């Protein structure tokens, strides 16, 4: 009779790198200014 | 005759994590200073 | 004979989005205070 099914193929390719992260939030307000 | 072709291989590995996002903007200017 | 190897597996999934960026720095010192 015919032979058995062949073996599995190679593993798939690794996925592409993820999207770059979002930008972080703006920083806090600065310190109060110098005295007048 | 030869058996039929094998099945697809296993799925690929997941992609690498994306790069970390940009540092956030500087905060706004601080309050006016105290009176002279 | 056994069949030929199967085709490659499906691609891995896209990577995770990168981490969000750092919060930005504190803002600059505020303006000088009033004269009085």
Residue numbers in the entry:
A (entry chain B), B (entry chain C), C (entry chain A): 1 to 36
Wording from the paper:
Collagens are an essential component of the extracellular matrix (ECM) of all higher organisms. The three-dimensional structure of this extended, non-globular domain requires a glycine in every third position, leading to a repetition of the triplet motif Gly-Xaa-Yaa. One of the important interaction partners of collagens in cartilage is the cartilage oligomeric matrix protein (COMP) a member of the thrombospondin family of proteins, also referred to as TSP-5.
To elucidate possible binding interfaces we used an unpublished crystal structure of a collagen peptide with the sequence Ac-(POG)4LKGHRGFTGLQG-(POG)4-NH2, which resembles the C-terminal COMP binding motif of collagen II. Docking was performed with ClusPro and the best 10 models analysed by manual inspection. Furthermore, no metal ion would be necessary for this interaction. In the docked model, Asp593 of COMP form hydrogen bonds to the arginine and lysine of the middle strand and the histidine of the middle chain. Asp594 and Asp595 interact with the lysine of the middle strand. By testing a generated triple mutant replacing all three aspartate residues by alanines, we could show that this potential MIDAS motif is not involved in the binding of COMP to collagen. Close to the C-terminal propeptide, the sequence 1128GLKGHR1133 matches this consensus. Interestingly, this motif (GXKGHR) overlaps with the recognition sequence of various other collagen binders (heparin, PEDF).
